[PDB]
Amino acid sequence: KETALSVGAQAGLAWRAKIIDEQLNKQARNLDAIYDFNSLVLEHNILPPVLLEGRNTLNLADAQSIRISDRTYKVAKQAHFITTPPTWRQYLWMDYVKPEAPNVTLLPKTKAEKEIWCIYTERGWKNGIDQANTILEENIARIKEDFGGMILYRKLLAMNMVSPPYVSHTDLGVTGDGSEIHIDDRVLRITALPELNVNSAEWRAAVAK
């Protein structure tokens, strides 16, 4: 019965996951080539924050009530320190196990149950294919979202729309008692989280050629 359908879903999803992990390992160097996080890092080893845009917004509230806007922008996540640039593997890699145990309960001994077992397993297999590809494209959308956010911050910082983050280095010389010492002690902090400006007269345009 439908047990064959369920295990067909599991087997198809797992096998397509295996093939797509194989393909993502097959094409390797162009991926981290194209997704360079490490050039996006600022001066003080700080990940730039993520920005989002929107063109030509209109929302109707109710009768006699609408609200339009030309362009919108939103800060998603603030900037912070990072001990390492990320990679794409925590955005694109997917897990893998083997669905391994059809219990010896539903085994077809007649031709009719044999073929309905076959077709139910087959449509489960196709369903698993579809579910795996849906998972992949959701991951694709997420990593494109984050890359677009940081590149939008770089564009606006060029545009003079956002103040850059401001740092402080408090230096201390020797410190500690006669048991413990550090040679020099530097404390690095950031203070001004980057945000949009509102003085439109300071917004600088740009015209190419």
Verify binding: residue 100, another protein, rule CB under 8 A.
no
Site string for its own copies, 189-208 (x = CB under 8 A): xxx-----------------
Smallest distance from its own copies to CB 191, Å: 8
CA-closest candidate to residue 133, choices 94, 90, 163 = 94
Q: Which two tokens stand for residue 130?
A: 């579809």
Site string for its own copies, 162-191 (x = CB under 8 A): -----------------xxxxxxxxxxxxx
Binding range to its own copies, per CB under 8 A, among 16-24, 65-73, 94-102, 110-118 = 65-73
Binding range to another protein, per CB under 8 A, among 16-24, 66-74, 114-122, 171-179 = 16-24
Verify binding: residue 84, another protein, rule CB under 8 A.
no
How far is the CA of 6 from the CAs of 36, 125, 133, in angstroms?
Answer: 41, 9, 18
Which residues, other chains included, contact 202 with Cβ-Cβ below 8 Å and sequence gap of 6+? 160
Verify binding: residue 132, another protein, rule CB under 8 A.
yes
CA-closest candidate to residue 67, choices 56, 75, 53 = 56
Smallest distance from another protein to CB 85, Å: 15
| CA–CA gap between residue 153 and residue 164 (Å, rounded) | 10
Verify binding: residue 64, its own copies, rule CB under 8 A.
yes
Binding range to another protein, per CB under 8 A, among 36-44, 94-102, 171-179, 184-192 = 94-102
CB 18 within 8 Å of CB 87? no
Under DSSP, the state recorded for 183 is S
Verify binding: residue 84, its own copies, rule CB under 8 A.
no
Closer CB to its own copies, 56 or 110, in the complex? 56
| CA–CA gap between residue 203 and residue 141 (Å, rounded) | 31
Q: What number of other Cβ atoms are within 10 A of residue 132's Cβ? A: 19
Which residues, other chains included, contact 135 with Cβ-Cβ below 8 Å and sequence gap of 6+? 94
Give the residues lining the site for its own copies (CB under 8 A): 57, 60, 63-75, 80-81, 83, 179-191
Interface contacts to another protein, rule CB under 8 A: 3, 6, 13, 17, 21-22, 25, 89-90, 93-97, 103-106, 131-132, 135
